[PDB]
Design an enzyme around this catalytic site. Sequence first.
Site, short mmCIF file in Angstrom:
data_model
loop_
_atom_site.label_atom_id
_atom_site.label_comp_id
_atom_site.label_asym_id
_atom_site.label_seq_id
_atom_site.Cartn_x
_atom_site.Cartn_y
_atom_site.Cartn_z
N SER A 130 11.89 36.36 -12.40
CA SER A 130 12.87 36.96 -11.51
C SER A 130 14.19 36.22 -11.62
O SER A 130 14.22 35.02 -11.88
CB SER A 130 12.34 36.93 -10.07
OG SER A 130 13.32 37.34 -9.13
N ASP A 151 -6.86 44.77 -9.93
CA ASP A 151 -6.32 43.42 -9.87
C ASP A 151 -5.60 43.05 -11.16
O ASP A 151 -6.23 42.67 -12.14
CB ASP A 151 -7.46 42.43 -9.61
CG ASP A 151 -6.99 41.00 -9.51
OD1 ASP A 151 -5.78 40.78 -9.39
OD2 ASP A 151 -7.86 40.09 -9.54
#
Length: 330
Positions: free
Chosen positions: A199, A35
């Site tokens: 992004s 994770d």
Amino acid sequence: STGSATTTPIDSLDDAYITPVQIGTPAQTLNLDFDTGSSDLWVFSSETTASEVDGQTIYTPSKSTTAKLLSGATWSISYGDGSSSSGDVYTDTVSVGGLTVTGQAVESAKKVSSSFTEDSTIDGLLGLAFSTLNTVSPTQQKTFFDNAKASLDSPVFTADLGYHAPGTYNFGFIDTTAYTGSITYTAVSTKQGFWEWTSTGYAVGSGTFKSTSIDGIADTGTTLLYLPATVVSAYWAQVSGAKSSSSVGGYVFPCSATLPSFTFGVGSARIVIPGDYIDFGPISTGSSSCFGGIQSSAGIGINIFGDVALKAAFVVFNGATTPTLGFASK
């Protein structure tokens, strides 16, 4: 040193991925959920409340000659999905894919929430976010990666998750045969303890690319792709009959649909998520309403590039003095 381990989807939907991890001496192999959105290595154990164990493999520290109680240390964690676990702490030898760390904090669960109990395939979590998020008190502990880092050939790990198929976590090296083209690296903020990046925009299907900054986290422990409501609405508007269902808890779409791809930007590069990666199947057995793999982050407080996004790429988690993230097509 290096390590390399195969990671395997837990079910036919790729709801999560499990990777075998050797703990203790002799080794006890547990299948952990790696994770990159948390920083605790915790396991089902001989200390876990018996009624909260249902099929998981447990770590028994009393059977490990290298286990030592970390005296006075406790831990307690809550995840973004509302699940939680807590307990006490041992140090022990932990190996992943041939890479060994001695003195790793292994957090033994005394209690786990129902979601963990109900998932027989996940024996615990191995956190790979920054150690500043580790919950051990009163002495915070380091992640497996942080402990291994200095010994690694290069201070990196990579995630290569499969679509409906196994994939690979590598530590200490970049497998140049595992991706196509080049890796595009992008800046990381560690201020919130995550692999947080920005992004450069998105496209829906064959549509034009929208240049827009989307801050979010690379999180292997989250199944879906969570993005701003504007972006998500633009995606689902291209699927006839798709709608946001408050009763179901997100966007659903007719199972008869063909889903468009979704592209996200990494610098000037582009990662394409095929439409099929966005199908999470019937909302309940036999239903013709299917659950979407792109959902709104509104009210999470952060955008999350979960498995839906990451499995479309070869992803480098670069833990150099100034961390960065790399993405390649594959």
